[PDB]
Design a protein around this ligand. Structure first.
Ligand SMILES: *C(=O)N1CCC(Cc2cccc(Oc3ccc(C(F)(F)F)cn3)c2)CC1
Ligand SMILES: [Cl-]
Length: 541
C-alpha cells in the first residue's frame, strides 16, 4: 500500500498549499480594500452580479477576491476545495469584456480537466498526473469571461452519492456536519450551498448533480447527455455508451442555470467540439409563461419517499394547480426493469472489471460501502447468490444478477432494449400529452457514510439517466419537526437492508432542505428550466 499513502501525503501537501495561497491572496486584497461591502456583494443574485460586472460598477477583482475569501472561509467547516486554480488571477485580467459571464468566479468538480492540475477522482493512480490542457467546457467558460478558480472534492472514483476519498478526505454538508453533502458533485453542493461560489459545473450519470444540489439546498440541471461537450472530462471508465454521462450547472437559483447554459451553448463550444449538435439556447421557450400539462407522481413504488419528500411533491402539485397548470397522474411504466436490468446492466456490462482496475493497490473509502467487494465477486457466484436471495430479497437479487460480465452480443441486445424502453416512455408521455413531469427527489440529506449502503435510493434520479431526459432539482421546503417524527413509521416497500439503512439515515433532519425534480423530453432543456423557474417562483418566495 505504501505508494497509495505517498499519493495521499502529496495530495494533502498540495491542498494545504493551495488553501495557504488563497488566504495570502485574500489578505492582500482586504488590506488594500478595507471598506468594500463584502456581505452585500456575496448576497447579490448572479444575474445582478453579472449586470454589475458588465456595466463596470463592480470590478472583477472585487468580485473575485471577495468570493475567494468566502470559499476559503466556508471550506473550513466543509472540506470542499481540493485545489486553487493558481492562474485564475491572470485570467481575471484577460477576461473577454463582452462575455456573458464576464468576471464570474466559477467552481469546477475535480473531473473537469484544468491545465497543470490533477483530476485525481480520489484515486491514487491519478495522483501526480497533471492535465495537459483545459477541457472544452472550461475553455468555453473562459471565452465567455468566467474565472474558474477551484476544483471541488468528489467521492473516490465518483461512484458514490456521498463525498469522501482517501486523498482529500470527507466533504461535509454545510447545514449539518453529521450529514452528507451528496455526490458525486458534492464539493460543488457544499461550496455553492454555503455561499462560496455563485456557479459551478458538475456531472451526473446516476443522479450526481441532483443529489448534491438537493441535499445542500441549491438548484442543478442534468441536461440531455450530448447537449454539452464531455471532451476532456476525466473518468473511471471510457467507452460505456448505454447509460450516458451528462454535465450541467449548479447554482443558487434557476435563472443562474439558464444563464450558464446560454453562455455554454455558443459558437465556441460548437467549434471546439463539433460532435455536439449546435443547438442554441432558445430563450423564448425558457421565458414562456403559458400553462403547462404537468405529469406527476408521489412515489416511484421503488423507494418509499420520506414524509418530507411526499409533502414537497404534494405542495408543489397543489400550488402549480392554483396557478392554472393541469396536473395529470403519471408514472413511467416498468421502472423496476429500467433500474435493475437496463441501468445496472448498462453501467456494469463488464461486471465492473474496468471500474475495478482503478482501485488496484488503493484504499477503498468507506463511503463506497461494499460496492468494490460485490463487483469483485466471480460471475458464477453473483448468479448463485442472486438465486439464493431471490425469494427473500428480490431487489438485492436483481442487482447482483444484472452486474455480471457479458458478451458484445448481449450488450447489443441490452442497448436495443434501452432504445425501445425510451420509445415506450416517450409514447406513454405523448398519449397523456404531457409538456413536463414532476417527481419526488431524494431527501433530506442522508447521514455521512450511508449513501454507500442506501443503494436503491438512487431510483428517483437513475430513471432519467436511463431514459436520457433532462432533469433538474429545485428546493421547495425544509424538513419540519412533524416530517422528522413521521420517519419513525417509515417502513419501505421491500424491508431489505437498503430500506433499513435509508430509514435510519434520514432521521435527525429538522431544518434541512428538500427538493422536487422537474423533467422534460430529450433536448428540451429550455422547457425543463421554464418549469423549474415556475416551481421556484411559486414555492420559494
Ligand atoms: C452520480 O451520477 N453517481 C452515479 C451513481 C452512484 C450510485 C450508484 C452506485 C452503485 C450502483 C449504482 O447503480 C444502480 C443501478 C440500479 C439500482 C437499483 F436497481 F435501483 F437498485 C441501484 N444502483 C448507482 C452515485 C454517484
Ligand atoms: Cl446525438
Amino acid at each position: 500500500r505504501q505508494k497509495a499513502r505517498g499519493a495521499a501525503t502529496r495530495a494533502r501537501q498540495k491542498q494545504r498549499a493551495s488553501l495557504e495561497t488563497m488566504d495570502k491572496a485574500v489578505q492582500r486584497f482586504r488590506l488594500q480594500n478595507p471598506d468594500l461591502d463584502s456581505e452585500a456583494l456575496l448576497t447579490l443574485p448572479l444575474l445582478q452580479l453579472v449586470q454589475k460586472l458588465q456595466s463596470g460598477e463592480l470590478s472583477p477583482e472585487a468580485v473575485f477576491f471577495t468570493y475567494l475569501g468566502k470559499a476559503w472561509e466556508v471550506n473550513k467547516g466543509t472540506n470542499c476545495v481540493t485545489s486553487y486554480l493558481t492562474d485564475c488571477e491572470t485570467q481575471l485580467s484577460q477576461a473577454p469584456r463582452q462575455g456573458l459571464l464576464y468576471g464570474v468566479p466559477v467552481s469546477l468538480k475535480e473531473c473537469f480537466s484544468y491545465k497543470g492540475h490533477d483530476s485525481t477522482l480520489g484515486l491514487s493512480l491519478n495522483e501526480g498526473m497533471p492535465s495537459e490542457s483545459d477541457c472544452v467546457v472550461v475553455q468555453v467558460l473562459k471565452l465567455q469571461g468566467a474565472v474558474p478558480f477551484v476544483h471541488t472534492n468528489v467521492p473516490q472514483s465518483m461512484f458514490s452519492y456521498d463525498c469522501s476519498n482517501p486523498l482529500f478526505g470527507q466533504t461535509m454538508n454545510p447545514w449539518k456536519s453529521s450529514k452528507s453533502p451528496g455526490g458525486s458533485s458534492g464539493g460543488e453542493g457544499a461550496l455553492i450551498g454555503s455561499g462560496g461560489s455563485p456557479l459551478g459545473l458538475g456531472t451526473d450519470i446516476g443522479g450526481s448533480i441532483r443529489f448534491p444540489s438537493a441535499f445542500c439546498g441549491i438548484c442543478g440541471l442534468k441536461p440531455t447527455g450530448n447537449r454539452l461537450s464531455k471532451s476532456g472530462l476525466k473518468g473511471c471508465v471510457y467507452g460505456q455508451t448505454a447509460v450516458q454521462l451528462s454535465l450541467g450547472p449548479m447554482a443558487r437559483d434557476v435563472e443562474s442555470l439558464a444563464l450558464c447554459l446560454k453562455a455554454l451553448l455558443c459558437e465556441h463550444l460548437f467549434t471546439l467540439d463539433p460532435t455536439v449538435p449546435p443547438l442554441p439556447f432558445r430563450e423564448e421557450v425558457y421565458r414562456s409563461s403559458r400553462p403547462l400539462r404537468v405529469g406527476y407522481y408521489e412515489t416511484d413504488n421503488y423507494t418509499m419517499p420520506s414524509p418530507a419528500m411526499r409533502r414537497a411533491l404534494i405542495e408543489t402539485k397543489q400550488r402549480l394547480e392554483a396557478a392554472g397548470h393541469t396536473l395529470i397522474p403519471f408514472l413511467p411504466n416498468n421502472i423496476p426493469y429500467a433500474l435493475e436490468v437496463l441501468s445496472t446492466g448498462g453501467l456494469f456490462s463488464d461486471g465492473g472489471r474496468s471500474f475495478l482496475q482503478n482501485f488496484k493497490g488503493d484504499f477503498v473509502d468507506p463511503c463506497l460501502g461494499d460496492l468494490i467487494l460485490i463487483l469483485r465477486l466471480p460471475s458464477w457466484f453473483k448468479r448463485l447468490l442472486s438465486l439464493l436471495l431471490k425469494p427473500l430479497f428480490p431487489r438485492l437479487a436483481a442487482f447482483l444478477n444484472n452486474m455480471r460480465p457479458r458478451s458484445a452480443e448481449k450488450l447489443w441486445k441490452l442497448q436495443h432494449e434501452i432504445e425501445m424502453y425510451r420509445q415506450s416512455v416517450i409514447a406513454q408521455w405523448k398519449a397523456m400529452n404531457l409538456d413536463v413531469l414532476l417527481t419526488p427527489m431524494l431527501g433530506p440529506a442522508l447521514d455521512l457514510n450511508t449513501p454507500g449502503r442506501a443503494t436503491g435510493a438512487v431510483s428517483y434520479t437513475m430513471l432519467y439517466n436511463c431514459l436520457d431526459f433532462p432533469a433538474g432539482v429545485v428546493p421547495v421546503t425544509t424538513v419540519t419537526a412533524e416530517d422528522d417524527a413521521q420517519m419513525e413509521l417509515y417502513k419501505g416497500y421491500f424491508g431489505d437492508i437498503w430500506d433499513i439503512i435509508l430509514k435510519k439515515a434520514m432521521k435527525n433532519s429538522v431544518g434541512l432542505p428538500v427538493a422536487v425534480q422537474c423533467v422534460a423530453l430529450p433536448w428540451q432543456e429550455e422547457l425543463c428550466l421554464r418549469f423549474m423557474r415556475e416551481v421556484e417562483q411559486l414555492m420559494t418566495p
